[PDB]
Amino acid sequence: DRDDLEISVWKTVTAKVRAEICLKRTELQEYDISNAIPDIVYEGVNTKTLDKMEDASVDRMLQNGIN
Amino acid sequence: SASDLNRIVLEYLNKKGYHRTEAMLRAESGRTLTPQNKQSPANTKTGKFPEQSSIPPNPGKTAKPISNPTPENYIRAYSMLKNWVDSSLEIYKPELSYIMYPIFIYLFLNLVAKNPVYARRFFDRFSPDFKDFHGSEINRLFSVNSIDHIKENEVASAFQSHKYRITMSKTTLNLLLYFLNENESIGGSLIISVINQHLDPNIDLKLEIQKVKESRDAIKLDNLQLALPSVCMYTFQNTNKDMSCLDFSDDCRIAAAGFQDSYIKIWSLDGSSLNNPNIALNNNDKDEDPTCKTLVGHSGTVYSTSFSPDNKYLLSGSEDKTVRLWSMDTHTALVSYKGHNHPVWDVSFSPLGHYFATASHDQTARLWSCDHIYPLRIFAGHLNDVDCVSFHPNGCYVFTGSSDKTCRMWDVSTGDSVRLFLGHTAPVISIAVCPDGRWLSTGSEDGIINVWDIGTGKRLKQMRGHGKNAIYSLSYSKEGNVLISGGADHTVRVWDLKKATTEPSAEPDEGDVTASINQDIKEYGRRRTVIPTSDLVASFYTKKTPVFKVKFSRSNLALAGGAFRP
Amino acid sequence: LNDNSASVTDTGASQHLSNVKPGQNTEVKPLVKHVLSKELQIYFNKVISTLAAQHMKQAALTSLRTDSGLHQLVPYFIQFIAEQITQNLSDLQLLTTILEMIYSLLSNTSIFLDPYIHSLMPSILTLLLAKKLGGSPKDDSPQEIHEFLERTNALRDFAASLLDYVLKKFPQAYKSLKPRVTRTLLKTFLDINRVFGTYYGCLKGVSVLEGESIRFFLGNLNNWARLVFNESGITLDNIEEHLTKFTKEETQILVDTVISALLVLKKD
């Protein structure tokens, strides 16, 4: 069970902080409970539509000079 | 000048025919606060649904708020258990698939003895699901329609003698008992009586239900503590100051915004299709659907908008002197409602969706109905025009706030005002009444919220944390009292209603650094700054967008909404 | 109550780029023990001590499921769920009770649980894909082997049907825990050196998904069978007494469960 790269390096580089966390609970990271934001089902466009309008205008330049 | 008002009151009672003992006791009744109703939102154990009896409401047959203390048919009482066991493909699915049959059979055999047409509803409603599991026995139970029809079917007559046996585990029996104890008055007690009197559970039963109720009573939450809500903010971008007050539906799938150029804009908040295609799918993909529908029926500017609790209809009030109704599944107008001669400022549906109240510039509120073109009641008695309108959560009183620094509670049947609440110093702009119903809260354009109690009519306390500016919206916690105020100073604030009252609401036992130093900076000056009450706990600023709407959802998540201003 | 030759090309290129990609934090404060009243932690220890006496356990389960006002104790429950999972990973009755109180909080529609979705999914994904769950098989008996196997498979079949409950309770987090969980299952499934029960939990978690994702495991199943079952040039005749890692019973369980989920892709 040592032929997995991303799980072995996750065991190695986190081995000090998780011992302190599990010693703290009996009184990047994915199990700090308080500092987590949820996910929205749909958020609106705020930047992609600008470049979408710009390369759409370039596409209206790309159609051989018809306005 | 208040002792002279007390003397004028005493002489008014003496000339209007109140005995000295009677006037003293009515004064003592007027002074004491409205006590606590322990079934305040009607908890689902000892609380009942409203009757659907096709009559209009009536606030009579009712005692006073000052005094201390405070049939259910078989089809819904079975459909509760049916949906509860139908929502699970878990490890406990086929045991409920086992036990769902004889409770239905015994409810049918106990309902043919009382009401035959309700029994004919109840049999054919839940017929075709286990016909392949239980054979032609339900075909044998077609011919039972009376008490004497039970003597024809030998197995139906045997069902009174032969108690139906079922071998049930301890975890399934305790699951069923602790499900049917947590909501008695929906029909859980009606299921429990049939289980106790007609079934044979293999493992006394009355002692078992006594132990269930006692262990369920041994661990509850008596006095609740506060909780800070999570606010999801919907910011609208390309509205060049021409978006009036908006509203969200319930399930939060549709948003409705009224524009200054006589549109209603309808947004699918999930990015959905919002085209209602109805699988035929004829034609017209040539049009441009940006997941947003526009509604053009008004000729004036839309100043308010309200969603039905059914969430299938929209009610838009404009400055052309109509209120229009829109279908949210074909996106057209249905009914125009003409009863005003001035602009309409606040439409609001009922709790049960029966009939909507309206505010307008003509200093009168009007009660309507969705099937009548013209009004039903006229609420007159304010000095200036009515700004906000709201019902009591039973749909039995109306609350109107007006620009002459006051608000009123109106009887919905007799039309005349029952309460007049004085004490503000600015146009009341948003009003809201708690799900308990005993306390009224409203916000003015002075940035001051305040709460009265409807029994005494006087002020419990106020709230002084907003800027000297408008409080656009107001919302309540679903279970308990935490007020969420979204105003004009770009903040959404959180308020504890139960600090300075006789209900302290379970304060923590044991300090801060940021507390009492933030408004002790006072760089701008003592008289040129606000000083918050002890009731304000948090305040979320929105960075240059104002919040038109706060809508507290069912699960401690509020939603705010507004337009990005520059 | 909030929490009161240059080295800058690593604190700016991979400490605020591989942190701004999973959200952002400003130090929500869990523990000073001044944030809970007296009666609140009285109720908290009275519910954590009881998790003739099964009635009190079901009363605590239903009090978690239906009562409101426990929005302050909901981070203290996911702490004392995770420690009784990763610290007591040997007793199946306690793990069953902890999964019951996971399901009880996950049906309470009066508390907001979408913040805590990432600290509640690894408990479900570690009681489903554990390398060992019981740990004390009481060997030298085929009856005890079968009994321990059914006792540890009941927890896989329960935790797999708790993963499908949280893929439908939170549909707003779709495209944020559907590809994450199916990537966890595809990562844990595609190897040789795992124990049988982890493969069983992986295939049951595949079964509680739906649609083309199950079709997404159609191609890489042939080589998975050719590596885990050793059909090195076999002609399907002596299959009863041919194979090497497993025993006959658990191979029959694997061939049963690999088509218990494959029936979904041919019924439409």
PDB file of N, CA, C and O in Angstrom, chain C residues 178 182 206 209-218:
ATOM      1  N   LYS C 178     -20.243  15.777  -5.843  1.00  0.00           N
ATOM      2  CA  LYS C 178     -20.385  14.619  -6.719  1.00  0.00           C
ATOM      3  C   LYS C 178     -19.050  14.256  -7.383  1.00  0.00           C
ATOM      4  O   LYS C 178     -18.655  13.082  -7.278  1.00  0.00           O
ATOM      5  N   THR C 182     -16.926  10.846  -6.259  1.00  0.00           N
ATOM      6  CA  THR C 182     -16.633   9.821  -7.259  1.00  0.00           C
ATOM      7  C   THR C 182     -15.149   9.775  -7.617  1.00  0.00           C
ATOM      8  O   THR C 182     -14.657   8.709  -7.996  1.00  0.00           O
ATOM      9  N   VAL C 206     -20.291   3.129  -5.459  1.00  0.00           N
ATOM     10  CA  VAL C 206     -20.580   3.242  -6.885  1.00  0.00           C
ATOM     11  C   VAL C 206     -22.058   2.958  -7.140  1.00  0.00           C
ATOM     12  O   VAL C 206     -22.706   3.630  -7.954  1.00  0.00           O
ATOM     13  N   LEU C 209     -24.419   5.843  -6.514  1.00  0.00           N
ATOM     14  CA  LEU C 209     -24.449   6.864  -7.548  1.00  0.00           C
ATOM     15  C   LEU C 209     -25.478   6.470  -8.605  1.00  0.00           C
ATOM     16  O   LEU C 209     -26.249   5.521  -8.433  1.00  0.00           O
ATOM     17  N   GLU C 210     -25.492   7.191  -9.724  1.00  0.00           N
ATOM     18  CA  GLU C 210     -26.458   6.892 -10.770  1.00  0.00           C
ATOM     19  C   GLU C 210     -25.928   7.348 -12.119  1.00  0.00           C
ATOM     20  O   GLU C 210     -25.021   8.179 -12.210  1.00  0.00           O
ATOM     21  N   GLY C 211     -26.508   6.774 -13.171  1.00  0.00           N
ATOM     22  CA  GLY C 211     -26.318   7.292 -14.512  1.00  0.00           C
ATOM     23  C   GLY C 211     -24.968   6.958 -15.126  1.00  0.00           C
ATOM     24  O   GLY C 211     -24.344   5.933 -14.827  1.00  0.00           O
ATOM     25  N   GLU C 212     -24.510   7.877 -15.985  1.00  0.00           N
ATOM     26  CA  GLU C 212     -23.330   7.682 -16.824  1.00  0.00           C
ATOM     27  C   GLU C 212     -22.049   7.516 -16.015  1.00  0.00           C
ATOM     28  O   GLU C 212     -21.089   6.922 -16.524  1.00  0.00           O
ATOM     29  N   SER C 213     -22.027   8.019 -14.773  1.00  0.00           N
ATOM     30  CA  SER C 213     -20.899   7.797 -13.872  1.00  0.00           C
ATOM     31  C   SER C 213     -20.654   6.311 -13.643  1.00  0.00           C
ATOM     32  O   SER C 213     -19.500   5.865 -13.626  1.00  0.00           O
ATOM     33  N   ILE C 214     -21.728   5.527 -13.508  1.00  0.00           N
ATOM     34  CA  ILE C 214     -21.586   4.075 -13.443  1.00  0.00           C
ATOM     35  C   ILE C 214     -21.066   3.541 -14.773  1.00  0.00           C
ATOM     36  O   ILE C 214     -20.157   2.697 -14.806  1.00  0.00           O
ATOM     37  N   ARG C 215     -21.567   4.097 -15.885  1.00  0.00           N
ATOM     38  CA  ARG C 215     -20.992   3.829 -17.201  1.00  0.00           C
ATOM     39  C   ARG C 215     -19.542   4.279 -17.282  1.00  0.00           C
ATOM     40  O   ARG C 215     -18.743   3.664 -17.999  1.00  0.00           O
ATOM     41  N   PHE C 216     -19.171   5.306 -16.507  1.00  0.00           N
ATOM     42  CA  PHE C 216     -17.790   5.765 -16.450  1.00  0.00           C
ATOM     43  C   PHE C 216     -16.853   4.735 -15.828  1.00  0.00           C
ATOM     44  O   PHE C 216     -15.635   4.848 -15.998  1.00  0.00           O
ATOM     45  N   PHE C 217     -17.381   3.736 -15.116  1.00  0.00           N
ATOM     46  CA  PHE C 217     -16.565   2.641 -14.617  1.00  0.00           C
ATOM     47  C   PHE C 217     -16.742   1.370 -15.439  1.00  0.00           C
ATOM     48  O   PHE C 217     -16.412   0.279 -14.963  1.00  0.00           O
ATOM     49  N   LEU C 218     -17.264   1.488 -16.663  1.00  0.00           N
ATOM     50  CA  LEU C 218     -17.438   0.310 -17.505  1.00  0.00           C
ATOM     51  C   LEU C 218     -16.118  -0.131 -18.130  1.00  0.00           C
ATOM     52  O   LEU C 218     -15.845  -1.332 -18.230  1.00  0.00           O
TER      53      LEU C 218
END
